[PDB]
Amino acid sequence: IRVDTIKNALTYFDAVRSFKAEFIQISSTDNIPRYGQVLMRKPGLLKWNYYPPTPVSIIIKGKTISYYDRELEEYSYTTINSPIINLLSSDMKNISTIDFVNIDTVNNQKIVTLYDKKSESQAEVIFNINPITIVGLNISNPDSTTSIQFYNISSNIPIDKAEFKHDISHYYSE
Known part of the structure; x- marks a missing residue:
């Protein structure tokens, strides 16, 4: 049973090569909805743009x-080598280093x-x-759970690798 579980789980992840979507995010710490936009391109590119406030x-x-x-x-700037951090864009190598599916x-x-x-x-996808x-990503540890839902999703669209940069805009920029 273990093998079929992994193979099938990898199939669902494998179906999403890229996506652009809106997200709502809620942490059990404050129960306040936070909003933004997310871009993902496999392998390994993820952008999270939170909206004001x-x-x-x-x-x-x-x-x-x-x-x-x-x-x-x-x-x-930092680096965290945890299979969980960049789960949405990870290749099959990353997922395989997870201890339980x-x-x-x-x-x-x-x-x-x-x-x-x-x-x-834990993470639920x-x-x-x-x-x-x-459509959703729930991440849980002993202290808290954060729940993310995706909406207005466009999946498996081309995304330029240049899009994975911070949007920094000023009056004097142009």
Whole structure:
């Protein structure tokens, strides 16, 4: 049973090569909906653009993370080598380093649960089917859960690799 579970879970991830979507994000820490736009291009490119009042732009390239705070006009750079961080754009190599996969079927949706033992965090990925699309991502650890839903999704569209940069705009720019 283990092998068929992995193969089938990898099939659902494999169906999404790129996407552009809107997202709503809610953390159990404050229960406040946060909004933005997300771009994903396999392999390894992810952009998270939060809308005001959240002043945050995030570019993930492989495991490197670039964080731009619009209010402070400050950058942060780091690297986290966790299968969970860039799950949405990861190749099959990354997923395979996860310690536990499982698939459930609920209301014509497929829910893939993954568990990384190192970080003690779970992730549920929710797919629609016919056609396969990623509609949600729930990440949980002992302290909190963050739930993300995607909407207005365009899947498997061309996305220029140049699009994976922070949008930094000023009056004097042009």
